[PDB]
Amino acid sequence: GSMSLQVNLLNNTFANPFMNAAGVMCTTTEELVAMTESASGSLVSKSCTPALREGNPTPRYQALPLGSINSMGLPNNGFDFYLAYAAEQHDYGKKPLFLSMSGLSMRENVEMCKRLAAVATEKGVILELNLSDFDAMRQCLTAVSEVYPHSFGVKMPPYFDFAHFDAAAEILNEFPKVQFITCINSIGNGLVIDAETESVVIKPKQGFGGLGGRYVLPTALANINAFYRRCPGKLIFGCGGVYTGEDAFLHVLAGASMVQVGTALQEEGPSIFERLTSELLGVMAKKRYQTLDEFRGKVRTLD
Amino acid sequence: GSMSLQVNLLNNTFANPFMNAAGVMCTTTEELVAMTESASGSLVSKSCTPALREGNPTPRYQALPLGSINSMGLPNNGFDFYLAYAAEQHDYGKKPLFLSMSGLSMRENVEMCKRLAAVATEKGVILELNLSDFDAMRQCLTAVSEVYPHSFGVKMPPYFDFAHFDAAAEILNEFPKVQFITCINSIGNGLVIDAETESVVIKPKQGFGGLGGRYVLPTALANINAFYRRCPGKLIFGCGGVYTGEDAFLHVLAGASMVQVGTALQEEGPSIFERLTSELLGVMAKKRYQTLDEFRGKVRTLD
Ligand SMILES: Cc1cc2nc3c(=O)[nH]c(=O)nc-3n(C[C@H](O)[C@H](O)[C@H](O)COP(=O)(O)O)c2cc1C
Ligand SMILES: Cc1cc2nc3c(=O)[nH]c(=O)nc-3n(C[C@H](O)[C@H](O)[C@H](O)COP(=O)(O)O)c2cc1C
């Protein structure tokens, strides 16, 4: 019958839950345009700092059989650029836009949010605040909530135990404006060593870098589901290890409303969204689901 | 030329760096015997608590294409059992024995260590203290160091940033008795969801469990290398994601002295050690290394 990947959240309609993960294929105008032109339900701009950053020396990203490792160092065009893209360029008629923000301090986030406010108001761009200790997180969210008169989401690093799921959820649940939680950012500071070259594969930080892709899917599912459970009032956006509609299906089963695609998108480019939508639809059709609502968060436990 | 996987550490000679990861194929006499009979350089008994524990309801382990997930819940025959194995059964002529200890409180560890002391003294069993909060860690090590008159090692959870590498290393470095650091335990609380069944795959903890296997190799390498760098006075034992001699070679390059094998061993049985020694030798032969010393810790960075 009639299947739909439509997602409705944040006062928006998304054609499908897919979007790039922040930082992937979303740094330049060209990329943002490509993402916007893609079949993705949405996009998020590269996490921005107040000013442009060159980011780290290359190689700073490496695709791997099981994912990716990167230490990009937040190369980005700077907030004004993404603000301007959101304010003046982005075609919201095509899809909603998220703007990822990653100030290097609370003050930077506060100042960016102060300015993002009007554009969020005028254009509907949605903040994904990159949060990737808990007191600091609470302070950050307080400071941002103080100056930012809109719902926003937060991009979380993965956590690895319930104590942390609980503590993080507790924080986030303090902030009604935090309407979505994106789980997860990279698994931090993995170290890929190329057995052939007997070396690391990225240059910054002695080769340590965030892992994405296949490596991170169960972690991502865990986090998605953990926050899905602990933040019942909030939306969870999944991010981590999505290469296929089936992976996305897992994200949604774990609780994801939107499903972000990082490494796989980096490796395939924006055409991946046509394939993901089609695959997820295929998965849904095989499983006799018509909407994401029908199985979102419905992963069955055995206990 | 002549190649050797021999490892000399902790006043022992190991024929090769391989051993099981604690908890894998090392719970029962039969497993311990099998590990001892295997080609592994060593073995470590299942992390024990003062008394036997049934562990968690099954399924509590699931092998996966990329690794494993488990929430065993520390099923173990109890300390007396492993102590007795170390004291009276283990053939130290075949290989050294590590005894993993995972008391559920400092007190439990202290009480077991007090009793382990004489057996370590008399038989040479070596404690791997399962540490998998930094104050708690310091307190545990202090307590164990107070009462345990031997060098021992610690099984560490993976860390994911340098702040944690630094903090953990700083702590471990306060304890001269901590002579090896085993990196790593599982990546905590991943959630594997079976797209077919739309369910989790292990029963305890709503399906959340420690990830091992291919998922964890870069994390393991990161941790091994991080502590290798930060704890130059200590040996690092690698654990995580070893399925092949090539993987083991990575561990060693990252800094590993011993290389523990969990998931792959769980899946393959103790004959894996023949294959691993052979493969690691083959890797070393192709690379013209003759000893592990020649490349241990020599992973080349690009910066
Ligand atoms: C090249 C690259 C750049 C990234 N930059 C950002 C970023 O700017 N902001 C952010 O929140 N996450 C960033 N990440 C993390 C991704 O958003 C995503 O959380 C991570 O890659 C896991 O998703 P994946 O498994 O689909 O890769 C980056 C990841 C990659 C690979
Ligand atoms: C079935 C199973 C039981 C485990 N039990 C223990 C344990 O008792 N003590 C411990 O330190 N680690 C335990 N672990 C973690 C392993 O020692 C190892 O750290 C982890 O599996 C990563 O290694 P791998 O990638 O080779 O699996 C267990 C792992 C598995 C799979």
XYZ file of C-alpha atoms and ligand atoms in Angstrom:
668
model
C 0.000 0.000 0.000
C 0.900 3.657 0.549
C 4.246 3.946 2.288
C 5.787 7.148 3.407
C 9.107 8.104 4.911
C 7.609 11.384 5.852
C 8.654 12.743 9.196
C 6.931 15.582 10.900
C 8.801 17.342 13.609
C 9.994 20.781 14.633
C 7.002 22.318 12.850
C 8.370 20.912 9.622
C 7.608 18.207 7.185
C 10.448 16.102 6.023
C 10.056 13.985 2.937
C 12.175 11.356 4.557
C 14.249 11.011 7.687
C 17.577 11.182 5.889
C 20.061 13.961 6.057
C 23.796 14.337 6.101
C 25.569 14.052 9.372
C 26.987 17.385 10.353
C 30.399 17.882 8.865
C 29.890 15.573 5.964
C 29.306 17.136 2.541
C 27.979 20.311 4.053
C 30.834 22.726 4.410
C 30.771 24.674 1.203
C 28.050 26.320 -0.742
C 28.416 23.657 -3.394
C 27.975 20.881 -0.844
C 25.034 22.543 0.816
C 23.431 23.014 -2.555
C 24.154 19.421 -3.459
C 22.617 18.268 -0.189
C 19.620 20.471 -0.768
C 19.281 19.133 -4.320
C 19.697 15.581 -3.057
C 16.862 13.227 -2.151
C 17.664 13.801 1.541
C 14.790 14.868 3.775
C 17.052 17.495 5.222
C 20.561 18.666 5.649
C 22.703 20.155 8.253
C 25.481 22.574 7.645
C 29.006 21.915 8.798
C 29.468 22.604 12.472
C 30.566 26.177 12.589
C 32.738 28.284 14.749
C 32.392 32.049 14.875
C 35.176 32.457 12.359
C 36.338 30.220 9.593
C 38.789 27.463 10.464
C 41.255 25.760 8.186
C 40.927 22.657 10.314
C 43.680 20.149 10.783
C 46.463 19.175 8.443
C 45.669 16.441 6.015
C 45.196 13.623 5.737
C 42.542 14.162 8.344
C 39.920 11.815 7.093
C 40.262 8.262 5.977
C 37.558 5.990 4.696
C 37.937 2.460 5.982
C 36.412 -0.900 5.212
C 34.446 -0.572 8.432
C 33.872 3.135 8.481
C 36.024 6.182 8.725
C 38.355 7.904 10.997
C 38.823 11.612 11.000
C 40.301 14.469 12.881
C 39.008 17.240 10.652
C 39.642 19.901 13.271
C 36.365 21.649 12.529
C 37.347 23.134 9.160
C 34.413 25.324 8.394
C 33.581 28.563 6.659
C 32.607 30.148 9.901
C 29.255 31.037 11.316
C 28.504 34.062 9.161
C 28.796 31.843 6.120
C 26.309 29.235 7.358
C 24.108 31.929 8.775
C 24.069 33.583 5.349
C 23.409 30.304 3.689
C 20.467 29.776 6.041
C 19.297 33.382 5.772
C 19.702 34.045 2.091
C 20.485 31.011 0.018
C 18.943 27.884 1.284
C 15.764 26.857 -0.517
C 13.487 25.927 2.367
C 10.898 25.002 -0.242
C 13.097 22.027 -0.992
C 13.743 20.885 2.569
C 14.307 22.131 6.074
C 17.790 23.125 7.011
C 19.715 22.465 10.129
C 22.671 24.526 11.055
C 25.198 22.830 13.183
C 27.009 25.018 15.595
C 30.154 24.155 17.404
C 31.537 27.166 19.153
C 34.811 26.502 20.926
C 33.339 27.975 24.058
C 29.974 28.619 25.577
C 30.434 32.301 24.872
C 30.961 31.604 21.182
C 27.835 29.498 21.018
C 25.893 32.123 22.876
C 27.052 34.850 20.477
C 26.307 32.756 17.437
C 22.900 31.786 18.765
C 22.055 35.412 19.494
C 22.525 36.032 15.793
C 21.077 32.777 14.592
C 17.850 33.579 16.482
C 16.484 36.039 13.929
C 17.319 33.796 11.045
C 15.766 30.789 12.725
C 12.723 33.034 13.256
C 12.686 34.428 9.748
C 13.722 31.396 7.759
C 13.106 28.383 9.977
C 16.691 27.106 10.006
C 17.020 24.732 12.936
C 19.998 24.715 15.269
C 21.849 21.510 15.902
C 24.158 22.435 18.710
C 27.195 20.295 18.756
C 27.780 19.313 22.370
C 30.486 16.799 21.337
C 31.276 17.096 31.496
C 27.600 17.342 32.395
C 27.774 20.533 34.444
C 29.367 22.241 31.470
C 26.684 20.804 29.258
C 24.005 22.138 31.526
C 25.674 25.530 31.610
C 25.994 25.568 27.845
C 22.351 24.658 27.384
C 21.317 27.210 29.952
C 23.351 29.916 28.244
C 22.062 28.955 24.828
C 18.471 28.593 26.016
C 18.773 32.069 27.558
C 19.523 33.692 24.241
C 18.067 31.370 21.702
C 14.251 31.641 21.490
C 13.729 28.486 19.468
C 13.720 24.775 19.722
C 17.014 23.257 18.853
C 18.774 19.973 18.968
C 22.035 18.834 20.354
C 24.586 16.580 18.789
C 25.809 14.225 21.454
C 28.948 12.246 21.701
C 28.256 8.568 22.217
C 28.025 7.381 25.766
C 28.846 3.945 26.875
C 26.989 3.268 30.032
C 23.648 3.848 31.637
C 25.086 6.127 34.221
C 26.017 8.411 31.385
C 22.852 7.868 29.437
C 20.990 8.828 32.610
C 23.110 11.841 33.450
C 23.067 13.178 29.914
C 19.337 12.585 29.535
C 18.733 14.273 32.871
C 20.580 17.340 31.626
C 18.858 17.421 28.285
C 15.500 16.855 29.915
C 16.119 20.041 31.872
C 15.860 21.981 28.634
C 12.546 21.973 26.850
C 14.107 23.889 24.001
C 16.253 20.882 23.319
C 13.723 19.245 21.074
C 15.977 16.786 19.432
C 19.059 14.903 20.355
C 21.352 13.654 17.703
C 23.081 10.483 18.640
C 25.805 10.099 17.859
C 28.916 11.954 17.037
C 31.976 9.882 16.301
C 33.322 7.306 18.636
C 36.179 9.409 19.854
C 39.845 8.932 19.327
C 40.066 5.571 17.709
C 43.395 4.823 16.177
C 43.544 3.217 12.814
C 46.837 1.681 11.950
C 47.508 0.575 8.421
C 49.267 -2.788 8.764
C 50.916 -2.277 5.356
C 52.496 1.092 6.108
C 52.790 0.386 9.825
C 51.481 3.831 10.359
C 48.436 5.699 11.390
C 46.271 6.953 8.568
C 45.495 10.461 9.612
C 47.929 13.110 10.433
C 46.508 15.086 13.308
C 46.898 13.916 16.902
C 49.228 11.025 16.165
C 46.534 9.358 14.088
C 43.787 9.369 16.707
C 40.461 10.395 15.428
C 36.746 9.978 15.563
C 35.392 6.754 14.148
C 32.264 6.696 12.080
C 30.584 4.169 9.893
C 30.138 0.478 10.496
C 32.248 0.633 13.651
C 29.751 2.803 15.394
C 26.371 1.456 14.503
C 25.656 -0.491 17.718
C 26.954 2.415 19.719
C 24.775 4.752 17.730
C 21.732 2.452 18.169
C 22.486 2.235 21.882
C 22.610 5.947 22.217
C 19.658 6.574 20.030
C 17.672 4.115 22.014
C 19.010 5.205 25.361
C 18.000 8.760 24.813
C 14.840 7.704 23.073
C 13.937 5.950 26.289
C 15.201 8.579 28.658
C 14.031 11.642 26.792
C 10.510 10.573 25.890
C 9.539 14.169 25.254
C 12.251 14.767 22.692
C 13.042 13.621 19.233
C 16.108 11.557 18.639
C 18.018 11.914 15.425
C 20.119 8.925 14.662
C 23.598 9.278 13.347
C 26.155 6.600 13.065
C 26.782 3.681 10.844
C 24.002 4.188 8.336
C 24.961 2.796 4.958
C 21.703 1.185 3.991
C 18.002 1.581 4.414
C 18.250 -1.408 6.694
C 20.663 0.471 8.932
C 18.286 3.390 8.897
C 15.513 1.004 9.768
C 17.568 0.025 12.797
C 18.057 3.651 13.722
C 14.356 4.250 13.525
C 13.568 1.049 15.410
C 15.925 2.291 18.106
C 14.024 5.544 18.201
C 15.383 7.818 15.491
C 13.140 10.399 13.922
C 15.747 11.677 11.485
C 18.619 9.537 10.353
C 21.875 11.219 9.563
C 24.421 9.772 7.261
C 28.039 10.631 7.620
C 30.718 8.269 6.506
C 28.564 6.496 3.957
C 27.591 9.841 2.471
C 31.209 10.925 2.480
C 32.039 7.805 0.505
C 29.107 7.789 -1.862
C 28.079 11.403 -2.201
C 24.572 12.780 -2.068
C 23.074 10.262 -4.475
C 23.166 7.963 -1.464
C 19.892 9.521 -0.341
C 17.998 8.150 -3.311
C 19.386 4.760 -2.508
C 18.675 5.064 1.230
C 15.108 6.251 0.755
C 14.507 3.497 -1.739
C 16.129 0.922 0.515
C 14.314 2.000 3.606
C 11.090 1.924 1.650
C 12.031 -1.548 0.462
C 12.716 -2.626 4.029
C 9.462 -1.146 5.187
C 7.573 -2.841 2.382
C 9.139 -6.217 3.203
C 8.213 -5.731 6.846
C 4.791 -4.339 6.053
C 5.276 -0.917 7.502
C 3.789 2.101 5.884
C 5.139 4.835 8.078
C 8.115 5.363 10.298
C 5.784 6.017 13.239
C 4.771 2.391 13.011
C 8.077 1.067 14.193
C 10.040 4.044 15.502
C 11.386 3.179 18.907
C 9.708 -0.211 18.773
C 12.807 -2.337 18.968
C 11.776 -5.421 20.881
C 13.746 -6.338 23.973
C 13.982 -9.886 25.256
C 13.637 -8.986 28.906
C 65.669 -15.893 9.302
C 64.814 -16.908 12.862
C 61.532 -15.451 14.062
C 60.139 -15.498 17.503
C 56.891 -14.441 19.006
C 58.449 -14.791 22.392
C 57.603 -12.178 24.948
C 59.474 -11.646 28.151
C 57.691 -9.719 30.830
C 56.638 -9.958 34.427
C 59.532 -12.324 35.056
C 58.022 -14.755 32.629
C 58.677 -15.982 29.211
C 55.780 -16.344 26.890
C 56.092 -18.351 23.732
C 53.911 -15.874 21.975
C 51.930 -12.828 22.982
C 48.553 -14.439 22.489
C 46.201 -15.244 25.231
C 42.477 -15.309 25.644
C 40.713 -12.144 26.675
C 39.404 -12.427 30.186
C 35.972 -13.964 30.194
C 36.386 -15.788 26.943
C 36.923 -19.532 27.121
C 38.333 -19.352 30.624
C 35.529 -19.927 33.043
C 35.515 -23.667 33.547
C 38.291 -26.078 34.293
C 37.816 -27.497 30.825
C 38.226 -24.081 29.263
C 41.210 -23.255 31.394
C 42.744 -26.591 30.537
C 41.959 -26.055 26.869
C 43.534 -22.603 26.969
C 46.557 -24.056 28.672
C 46.773 -26.814 26.063
C 46.275 -24.343 23.266
C 49.095 -22.684 21.363
C 48.437 -19.442 23.222
C 51.333 -17.842 25.046
C 49.203 -17.415 28.099
C 45.709 -17.375 29.431
C 43.696 -15.475 31.887
C 40.976 -16.966 33.958
C 37.481 -15.545 33.851
C 37.081 -12.407 35.924
C 36.027 -13.719 39.225
C 33.983 -12.544 42.111
C 34.355 -13.861 45.625
C 31.575 -16.330 45.046
C 30.256 -17.967 41.943
C 27.813 -16.012 39.899
C 25.329 -17.446 37.475
C 25.572 -14.260 35.433
C 22.776 -12.796 33.357
C 19.891 -14.513 31.663
C 20.569 -15.779 28.181
C 21.000 -14.941 25.486
C 23.753 -12.795 26.898
C 26.276 -13.146 24.153
C 25.777 -12.838 20.488
C 28.439 -13.222 17.841
C 27.997 -10.707 15.070
C 29.445 -10.199 11.666
C 31.566 -7.372 13.044
C 32.187 -8.695 16.474
C 30.103 -9.575 19.433
C 27.889 -8.102 21.982
C 27.500 -9.457 25.419
C 26.180 -8.806 28.772
C 27.366 -11.942 30.476
C 26.916 -10.486 33.953
C 30.159 -11.973 35.246
C 29.161 -15.657 35.360
C 32.134 -17.221 37.006
C 32.980 -20.053 39.290
C 34.004 -17.691 42.024
C 37.402 -16.740 43.319
C 38.183 -19.935 45.233
C 37.776 -21.825 42.034
C 40.194 -19.739 39.999
C 42.530 -19.477 42.935
C 42.511 -23.250 43.221
C 43.098 -23.542 39.536
C 46.079 -21.187 39.838
C 47.296 -22.834 43.025
C 46.891 -26.477 42.226
C 45.925 -27.253 38.691
C 47.486 -24.915 36.259
C 50.549 -26.224 34.496
C 52.916 -23.283 34.766
C 55.397 -25.388 32.850
C 53.105 -24.950 29.877
C 52.525 -21.194 30.158
C 52.037 -18.432 32.654
C 48.597 -17.853 34.017
C 46.793 -14.655 34.644
C 43.878 -14.564 36.950
C 41.356 -11.894 36.264
C 39.657 -10.485 39.216
C 36.508 -8.505 39.154
C 35.239 -8.049 42.679
C 32.011 -6.089 42.823
C 33.482 -3.764 45.378
C 36.845 -2.579 46.541
C 36.418 -4.782 49.605
C 35.870 -7.833 47.466
C 38.985 -7.127 45.500
C 40.967 -6.513 48.617
C 39.769 -9.722 50.190
C 40.528 -11.731 47.076
C 43.896 -10.087 46.590
C 44.878 -10.877 50.163
C 44.297 -14.539 49.382
C 45.713 -14.354 45.888
C 48.965 -12.974 47.279
C 50.315 -16.294 48.525
C 49.350 -18.141 45.385
C 50.928 -15.494 43.179
C 54.009 -15.743 45.368
C 54.074 -19.533 45.329
C 52.872 -20.329 41.821
C 53.464 -17.176 39.796
C 49.863 -16.574 38.768
C 49.591 -12.935 37.740
C 46.622 -10.804 38.639
C 44.752 -8.926 35.946
C 42.543 -6.680 37.963
C 39.439 -5.792 36.080
C 38.959 -2.042 36.480
C 36.258 -1.887 33.795
C 35.159 6.769 37.719
C 38.768 7.696 38.251
C 38.525 8.190 41.953
C 37.067 4.696 42.258
C 39.936 3.511 40.140
C 42.477 5.232 42.295
C 40.796 3.890 45.407
C 40.784 0.340 44.013
C 44.430 0.468 43.030
C 45.406 2.005 46.330
C 43.544 -0.683 48.210
C 44.863 -3.478 46.038
C 48.364 -2.014 46.172
C 48.129 -1.804 49.963
C 47.228 -5.446 50.361
C 48.694 -7.119 47.313
C 52.460 -7.611 47.458
C 52.987 -8.204 43.751
C 52.945 -6.505 40.439
C 49.677 -6.884 38.662
C 47.874 -5.525 35.706
C 44.649 -3.807 35.144
C 42.008 -4.415 32.564
C 40.838 -1.043 31.382
C 37.654 0.038 29.745
C 38.292 1.879 26.502
C 38.612 5.612 26.711
C 37.748 7.929 23.903
C 39.683 11.062 24.468
C 43.025 12.267 25.524
C 41.692 13.841 28.688
C 40.678 10.355 29.768
C 43.832 8.762 28.475
C 45.752 11.318 30.503
C 43.636 10.986 33.597
C 43.716 7.204 33.532
C 47.416 7.083 32.751
C 48.101 9.524 35.535
C 46.327 7.261 37.971
C 47.919 4.087 36.726
C 51.292 5.760 36.851
C 50.886 6.319 40.558
C 50.990 2.580 41.048
C 54.311 0.920 40.400
C 52.670 -2.407 41.077
C 50.460 -1.914 38.039
C 52.922 -3.387 35.562
C 50.590 -4.049 32.690
C 47.540 -2.397 31.444
C 45.198 -4.346 29.345
C 43.459 -2.228 26.789
C 40.682 -2.792 26.257
C 37.550 -4.180 27.685
C 34.452 -4.045 25.562
C 33.136 -0.870 24.175
C 30.326 -0.460 26.702
C 26.648 -0.702 26.098
C 26.318 -0.916 22.410
C 22.932 -2.029 21.247
C 22.669 -4.555 18.523
C 19.365 -4.687 16.809
C 18.483 -7.507 14.485
C 16.667 -5.941 11.569
C 15.032 -9.281 10.816
C 13.504 -9.740 14.216
C 13.239 -6.034 15.001
C 14.667 -6.860 18.302
C 17.754 -6.714 20.346
C 19.884 -9.809 20.443
C 20.788 -10.157 24.039
C 18.398 -10.343 26.900
C 19.901 -8.411 29.778
C 19.789 -4.667 29.971
C 17.252 -4.182 27.148
C 19.809 -5.573 24.730
C 22.673 -3.256 25.639
C 25.969 -4.958 26.052
C 29.691 -4.675 25.575
C 30.920 -4.766 22.021
C 33.937 -6.763 21.071
C 35.488 -7.838 17.851
C 35.905 -5.867 14.666
C 33.909 -2.991 16.066
C 36.544 -2.255 18.616
C 39.867 -2.607 16.941
C 40.600 1.079 16.356
C 39.465 1.849 19.861
C 41.627 -0.912 21.218
C 44.592 0.296 19.172
C 43.928 3.819 20.367
C 43.878 2.777 23.941
C 46.801 0.450 23.652
C 48.785 3.152 22.004
C 47.597 5.879 24.321
C 48.649 4.011 27.406
C 51.717 2.723 25.709
C 52.721 6.346 25.234
C 51.541 7.555 28.595
C 52.696 4.702 30.777
C 56.193 4.028 29.509
C 56.989 2.261 32.803
C 54.275 -0.293 32.113
C 53.500 -3.032 29.663
C 50.382 -2.793 27.606
C 48.391 -5.856 26.775
C 46.257 -5.419 23.755
C 42.734 -6.680 23.713
C 40.109 -5.893 21.198
C 39.371 -6.858 17.690
C 42.083 -9.448 17.132
C 40.980 -12.012 14.630
C 44.141 -12.346 12.601
C 47.864 -12.229 13.003
C 47.623 -8.960 11.120
C 45.334 -7.572 13.773
C 47.742 -8.784 16.433
C 50.537 -7.126 14.531
C 48.549 -3.888 14.770
C 48.195 -4.328 18.475
C 51.838 -4.865 18.838
C 52.684 -1.939 16.608
C 50.421 0.159 18.777
C 52.404 -0.993 21.786
C 50.977 -4.332 22.897
C 53.217 -6.825 24.670
C 50.547 -9.491 25.054
C 47.623 -9.677 22.725
C 44.368 -10.988 24.029
C 41.721 -12.500 21.913
C 38.118 -12.415 22.974
C 35.400 -12.507 20.388
C 37.458 -14.277 17.735
C 38.428 -16.887 20.277
C 34.854 -17.213 21.416
C 33.870 -17.899 17.850
C 36.761 -20.072 16.824
C 37.876 -21.897 19.950
C 41.437 -22.236 21.258
C 42.756 -23.587 17.945
C 42.679 -19.948 16.905
C 45.978 -19.563 18.704
C 47.727 -21.851 16.257
C 46.330 -19.788 13.436
C 47.188 -16.501 15.090
C 50.760 -17.430 15.924
C 51.165 -18.687 12.386
C 49.593 -15.605 10.916
C 51.543 -13.190 13.052
C 54.705 -15.030 12.135
C 53.678 -14.803 8.483
C 53.035 -11.097 8.860
C 56.417 -10.657 10.513
C 58.075 -12.791 7.840
C 56.552 -10.711 5.013
C 57.656 -7.562 6.825
C 61.057 -8.969 7.751
C 60.664 -8.718 11.465
C 62.110 -11.420 13.578
C 60.946 -10.345 16.982
C 58.024 -8.432 18.374
C 60.490 -6.020 20.017
C 61.425 -4.838 16.563
C 58.150 -3.136 15.939
C 56.252 -3.052 19.194
C 55.004 0.475 19.734
C 56.625 1.659 16.525
C 53.462 2.674 14.765
C 54.439 5.576 12.609
C 52.596 8.824 12.970
C 52.229 11.323 10.193
C 52.701 14.451 12.338
C 34.424 14.061 7.821
C 33.609 14.167 8.973
C 33.378 15.424 9.516
C 32.596 15.531 10.654
N 32.336 16.746 11.123
C 31.381 16.887 12.048
C 30.905 18.140 12.384
O 31.307 19.154 11.829
N 29.917 18.259 13.353
C 29.415 17.122 13.956
O 28.524 17.220 14.789
N 29.893 15.889 13.624
C 30.871 15.750 12.685
N 31.256 14.518 12.332
C 30.564 13.327 12.912
C 29.378 12.938 11.994
O 28.421 13.970 12.065
C 28.719 11.688 12.572
O 28.335 12.000 13.913
C 29.749 10.542 12.621
O 30.492 10.462 11.391
C 28.984 9.217 12.766
O 28.167 9.070 11.612
P 28.545 8.046 10.465
O 28.725 6.733 11.083
O 27.398 8.126 9.528
O 29.852 8.556 9.929
C 32.041 14.380 11.254
C 32.276 13.130 10.706
C 33.071 13.017 9.568
C 33.331 11.733 9.015
C 31.783 -13.448 26.379
C 32.622 -12.437 26.902
C 32.909 -12.410 28.259
C 33.757 -11.410 28.750
N 34.042 -11.377 30.056
C 35.038 -10.607 30.494
C 35.566 -10.783 31.764
O 35.171 -11.680 32.525
N 36.606 -9.971 32.170
C 37.094 -8.986 31.308
O 37.995 -8.256 31.661
N 36.580 -8.818 30.069
C 35.566 -9.639 29.647
N 35.124 -9.494 28.407
C 35.807 -8.494 27.533
C 36.956 -9.210 26.779
O 37.977 -9.552 27.723
C 37.584 -8.222 25.794
O 38.013 -7.076 26.553
C 36.572 -7.729 24.770
O 35.783 -8.817 24.282
C 37.357 -7.118 23.589
O 38.110 -8.172 22.952
P 37.646 -8.796 21.582
O 37.449 -7.692 20.662
O 38.761 -9.708 21.276
O 36.363 -9.461 21.967
C 34.303 -10.435 27.903
C 34.035 -10.478 26.548
C 33.191 -11.469 26.039
C 32.920 -11.477 24.651
